[PDB]
Amino acid sequence: MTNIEILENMLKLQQKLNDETNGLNWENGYTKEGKLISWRRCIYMECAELIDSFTWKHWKNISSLTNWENVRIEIVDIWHFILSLLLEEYNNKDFKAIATEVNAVSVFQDFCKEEEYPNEGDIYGILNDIELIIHKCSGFGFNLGELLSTYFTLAIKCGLNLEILYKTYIGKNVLNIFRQNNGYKDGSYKKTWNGKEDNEVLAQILEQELDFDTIYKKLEECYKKA
Amino acid sequence: MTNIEILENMLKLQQKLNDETNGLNWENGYTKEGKLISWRRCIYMECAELIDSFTWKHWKNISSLTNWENVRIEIVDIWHFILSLLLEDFKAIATEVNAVSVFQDFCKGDIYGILNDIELIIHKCSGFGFNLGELLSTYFTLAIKCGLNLEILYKTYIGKNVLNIFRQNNGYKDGSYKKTWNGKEDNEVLAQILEQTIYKKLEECYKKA
Ligand SMILES: O=c1ccn([C@H]2C[C@H](O)[C@@H](COP(=O)(O)NP(=O)(O)O)O2)c(=O)[nH]1
Ligand SMILES: O=c1ccn([C@H]2C[C@H](O)[C@@H](COP(=O)(O)NP(=O)(O)O)O2)c(=O)[nH]1
Ligand SMILES: [Mg+2]
Ligand SMILES: [Mg+2]
Ligand SMILES: [Mg+2]
Ligand SMILES: [Mg+2]
Ligand SMILES: [Mg+2]
Ligand SMILES: [Mg+2]
């Protein structure tokens, strides 16, 4: 698959998931149940989850190491919401055009190369990069291009590349569907499965498996034992 | 009590807590263990907790109602960090706070509006260039909308300040503290105690976690 094909595939997956979650024409700003959609708030709330994957608190668990497994999950959650904002921001949707525009972001090319492992000395800078995303998404707006650039730069610093993002995205997209199919809206969903959060179980599954439908089935099996 | 006394007391309690937690001269930006302090980050992270006290998500638990108990706790957590910024004597600081026009009103629904005020605080705490005075006004405007007044802030602040000391005395720093006590977050147990010396209750309660 070309870089643009990978991006088109994620956009198409995001569209389908949003359509199923929110109803058609969620792009107009509300779900079918009348709830306001704020993709920017979604993003800065995942940014808070991302920050909490690091030992940023000066008063709590100060010798603990970075949770890099969760870092990757939160980077992927952010991406779901950025894809959503791309689709919202814009009858006939041209996914290839959108993909082509994302592909032209200067740092995207760098994102497509092999990932580098981060280390403790990178955390200060990573936290400041996340803070910039929070700032951009909490104001008036807002520039979608600067957001993409800042996002890919952050994702590189966090040890992701397009490959890791894509494969993890697919898995989380499946879990997102699973959640909606199992009581996420009405509060009946159990997010902890025999002591592990669903994201952690998904990560275990992803160590082996990439196939969309196989992932769903495996989630189903594990959730029976939740 | 007068408003100035209430403010001075909070500022005094904050200094004590920060001294005990971080060591003397935390005002220079580092803890005794050499960790960099960012009060603004502390604030926007509590803002996230505050947002999460409302049914903001369009895709999850969409019929749930606001957790006003937790709203009060997060408004109080934000206040600890604002006091820390103010401090980063007490009479003069209290005098400035008391002069904030919205503060006077504070001494006396619309969830998406509340959320927008929280968002403004997040925005102000995450940019390059910061104004503490403007944050104060936004904060008290929000706290009114959340149903607090000075009395509620002050009484809840005292209680959480006690929990904060308790935490530090019981392994918060080294990861041995249990933050969930027999199925309830420590903040929820605190809230139950505050319906009703606080430190002794916490210590007794902590025994069965
Ligand atoms: O309209 C929506 C709403 C949610 N999500 C997904 C994206 C993200 O992957 C996830 C975040 O769900 P959450 O409820 O914040 N839980 P967690 O952050 O632990 O995944 O929800 C969408 O893709 N579209
Ligand atoms: O230097 C510090 C560090 C922390 N805190 C307090 C303020 C706040 O009340 C609490 C927040 O701690 P937390 O670990 O974020 N946990 P929670 O938000 O659940 O109370 O910590 C201070 O007062 N000073
Ligand atoms: Mg989330
Ligand atoms: Mg998370
Ligand atoms: Mg997340
Ligand atoms: Mg907190
Ligand atoms: Mg909280
Ligand atoms: Mg809090």
Query: Could you give the C-alpha distances from B140 to B32, B55, B104, B107, in angstroms and in order?
Result: 32, 22, 10, 10
Q: What's the token pair of residue B72? A: 């009060």
Give the residues after which the backbone of chain B is interrupted, taking a C-to-next-N distance over 2.5 angstroms as a break.
Answer: 88, 108, 196
B59: closest CA among A77, A134, A89, A69? A77
Cβ atoms of A172 and A186 within 8 Å: the answer is no
Contacts A37 to B, Cβ<8 Å: 58
B74: closest CA among B66, B64, B63? B66
Ranges of each domain in chain A: 1-226
In this structure, the residue with its CA closest to atom 19 of ligand 1 is A199
Which residue's entry shows tokens 């309830």?
B184
Residue A58, min C-alpha distance to chain B (Å): 6
Residue B197: other Cβ atoms inside 10 A: 8
**Calpha distance A197→A66 (Å, rounded):** 17
- According to DSSP, the residues that pair with B185 across neighbouring strands are B180
| Alpha helices (H) along A52-113 | 68-89, 95-103, 108-111
Segment holding A196, helix H or strand E: strand A196-197
Residue B174 phi/psi, 5-degree rounding, is: -105, 5
**CB-ligand 2 contact for B164 (6 Å cutoff):** yes
Cβ atoms of A164 and A115 within 8 Å: the answer is yes
SS (H, E, C) chain B: CCHHHHHHHHHHHHHHHHHHHHCCCHHHCECCCCCECCHHHHHHHHHHHHHCCCCCCCCCCCCCCCCHHHHHHHHHHHHHHHHHHHHCCHHHHHHHHHCCHHHHHHCCCCHHHHHHHHHHHHHHHCCCCCCHHHHHHHHHHHHHHCCCCHHHHHHHHHHHHHHHHHHHHCCCCCCCCCCEECCEEHHHHHHHHHCCCHHHHHHHHHCCC
B1-209 CATH:
1.10.4010.10
A47: closest CA among A77, A69, A17? A77
Q: Which ligand 2 atom is at minimum distance from the Cα of B74?
A: 18
Q: Is B88 on the interface with A (CB under 8 A)?
A: no
Query: Could you give the C-alpha distances from B129 to A56, A95, B40, B111, in angstroms and in order?
Result: 21, 38, 11, 28
**Calpha distance B1→A137 (Å, rounded):** 42
Torsion over CA: A71, A77, A83, A88 (sign)? negative
In this structure, the residue with its CA closest to atom 9 of ligand 2 is B77
Partner B, chain A 96-135, Cβ-Cβ below 8 Å: 124, 127, 131-132, 134-135
**Calpha distance B181→B191 (Å, rounded):** 13
In this structure, the residue with its CA closest to atom 2 of ligand 2 is B18
Tell me A192's DSSP state: E
Using the CB atoms, write b or e for A119-135: b if 16+ within 10 Å.
Answer: eeebeeebbebbbbbbb
CATH of A1-226, one of 1.10.4010.10, 3.40.50.2300, 1.20.140.10, 2.60.40.10: 1.10.4010.10
Please name the amino acid found at residue A167.
Answer: K
Segment holding A193, helix H or strand E: strand A192-193
In this structure, chain A runs to a length of: 226
Residue B172 phi/psi, 5-degree rounding, is: -60, -40
Report CA dihedral (A168, A169, A173, A176) to the nearest 10 degrees. 70
- According to DSSP, the residues that pair with A30 across neighbouring strands are A36
Residue A221: other Cβ atoms inside 10 A: 10
Q: What's the token pair of residue A178? A: 């699973």
Reported as half-sphere exposure (CB side, CA atoms, 13 A), residue B12 has a value of 9
Segment holding A197, helix H or strand E: strand A196-197
Pairing of strands B184-185, A196-197: unpaired
**Calpha distance B176→B164 (Å, rounded):** 15
Q: Is B141 on the interface with A (CB under 8 A)?
A: no
Cβ atoms of A207 and A69 within 8 Å: the answer is no
Long-range residue pairs from A122-127, CB within 8 A, at least 24 positions apart, any chain: A122/A157, A123/A54, A123/A55, A123/A56, A123/A66, A124/B36, A125/A157, A126/A54, A126/A154, A126/A157, A126/A158, A127/A51, A127/A54, A127/A56, A127/B41
Q: What's the token pair of residue A90? A: 């814009």
Cβ atoms of A134 and A181 within 8 Å: the answer is no
A64–B31 C-beta distance less than 8 A: no
The separation between CA A40 and the C-alpha centre of its own chain, rounded to angstroms, equals: 13
**Calpha distance A168→A174 (Å, rounded):** 10
Give the residues after which the backbone of chain A is interrupted, taking a C-to-next-N distance over 2.5 angstroms as a break.
Answer: 90
Q: What's the token pair of residue A148? A: 């993409």
Cβ atoms of B193 and B69 within 8 Å: the answer is no
Question: Resolution to 1 decimal, in Å?
Answer: 1.6
B175–A61 C-beta distance less than 8 A: yes
**Calpha distance B81→A209 (Å, rounded):** 45
Cβ atoms of A134 and B120 within 8 Å: the answer is no
